[PDB]
Amino acid sequence: IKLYPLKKLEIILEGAHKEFATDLLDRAGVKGYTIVGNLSGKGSHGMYEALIMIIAAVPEELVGPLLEGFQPFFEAHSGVVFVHDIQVG
Amino acid sequence: KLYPLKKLEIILEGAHKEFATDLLDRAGVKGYTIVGNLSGKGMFALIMIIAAVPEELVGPLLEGFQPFFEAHSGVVFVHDIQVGRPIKF
Amino acid sequence: AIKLYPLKKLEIILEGAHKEFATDLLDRAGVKGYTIVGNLSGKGSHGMYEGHLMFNEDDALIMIIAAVPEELVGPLLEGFQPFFEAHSGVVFVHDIQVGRPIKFR
Numbered sequence: 001i002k003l004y005p006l007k008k009l010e011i012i013l014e015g016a017h018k019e020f021a022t023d024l025l026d027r028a029g030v031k032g033y034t035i036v037g038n039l040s041g042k043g044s045h046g047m048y049e050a051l052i053m054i055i056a057a058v059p060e061e062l063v064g065p066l067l068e069g070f071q072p073f074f075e076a077h078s079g080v081v082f083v084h085d086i087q088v089g
Numbered sequence: 090k091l092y093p094l095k096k097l098e099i100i101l102e103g104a105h106k107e108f109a110t111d112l113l114d115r116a117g118v119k120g121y122t123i124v125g126n127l128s129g130k131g132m133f134a135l136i137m138i139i140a141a142v143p144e145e146l147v148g149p150l151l152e153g154f155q156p157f158f159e160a161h162s163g164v165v166f167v168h169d170i171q172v173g174r175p176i177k178f
Numbered sequence: 179a180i181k182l183y184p185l186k187k188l189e190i191i192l193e194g195a196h197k198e199f200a201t202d203l204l205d206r207a208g209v210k211g212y213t214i215v216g217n218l219s220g221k222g223s224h225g226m227y228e229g230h231l232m233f234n235e236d237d238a239l240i241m242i243i244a245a246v247p248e249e250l251v252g253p254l255l256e257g258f259q260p261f262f263e264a265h266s267g268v269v270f271v272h273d274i275q276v277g278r279p280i281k282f283r
């Protein structure tokens with residue numbers, strides 16, 4: 001009935017690091033997340049068949065802090081974060 | 090070679106899938122992709138329905154999804170996208 | 179501190195039996211990675227797709243997620259055209275931001 005801007009993260013990583021991730025989201029004040037499982041992917045590390053994708057809608061001011069919190073991680077582990085623009089009602 | 094369109098990401102409990110797809114059909118949506126067996130915290134057995142739709146279906150669709158999400162878990166993310174041949178949509 | 183850069187993201191939806199055709203196109207174009215979401219269901223112009231119903235799971239619909247520099251979008255769609263004229267499926271092109279362009283281009 002009224003659309004508001006927001007950001008949406010797609011966070012793709014190895015499932016063994018999921019707790020760390022969802023845990024880190026919680027501390028930034030993210031209010032929810034949905035997780036897509038049993039993925040397969042091709043990367044610099046060359047192949048998988050696992051991996052998960054965490055979808056998180058978050059206010060734009062949280063983007064910075066989250067990317068910063070995930071920095072040390074992706075600099076030592078496989079994975080990627082895609083930042084989207086979205087609207088929610 | 091690309092035209093503008095909108096893409097919905099509809100996250101909700103699986104028991105309500107038919108309610109959700111009836112809304113898409115009844116509204117004129119020509120197609121949809123369903124991602125299954127999700128997990129979440131968020132109020133996003135969860136599924137995500139991906140629907141590419143002309144912008145002028147967005148209002149009407151959200152209108153139907155409103156009373157539902159006031160009484161049930163879930164969310165709707167609206168995205169901007171481009172496609173090659175909109176007629177298909 | 180962390181700068182963001184513009185990029186495009188494809189969602190490619192098609193029958194699983196054509197996965198190799200699709201990924202060959204990505205590899206040839208110079209796409210550096212992709213993520214595949216499996217065992218999907220869908221409604222198309224003609225019929226339902228329910229991979230829970232498939233006998234060989236490598237036959238259900240899949241969605242290929244590919245982050246790609248904008249200048250690969252044209253070429254990729256060009257290859258995906260004749261395919262989608264003769265087969266089920268669709269491509270959605272998204273705008274996105276990433277922290278590390280070099281990982282994608």
Ligand SMILES: Nc1ncnc2c1ncn2[C@@H]1O[C@H](COP(=O)(O)OP(=O)(O)O)[C@@H](O)[C@H]1O
Nearest residue numbers: 120121122139140141220221222223224266267
């Ligand atoms: N508007 C849409 N939004 C999301 N997914 C779609 C849409 N249209 C088609 N799809 C996906 O593509 C699949 C095949 O669609 P389509 O090519 O129209 O099939 P068919 O050849 O049987 O008409 C669908 O099952 C669905 O997953």
Ligand SMILES: Nc1ncnc2c1ncn2[C@@H]1O[C@H](COP(=O)(O)O)[C@@H](O)[C@H]1O
Nearest residue numbers: 041042043044078079211212213244245
């Ligand atoms: N360009 C990309 N597009 C989509 N997914 C990607 C991309 N690059 C990496 N990924 C995902 O991230 C995983 C790890 O890649 P890497 O970080 O290179 O090890 C891959 O298996 C993919 O699932």
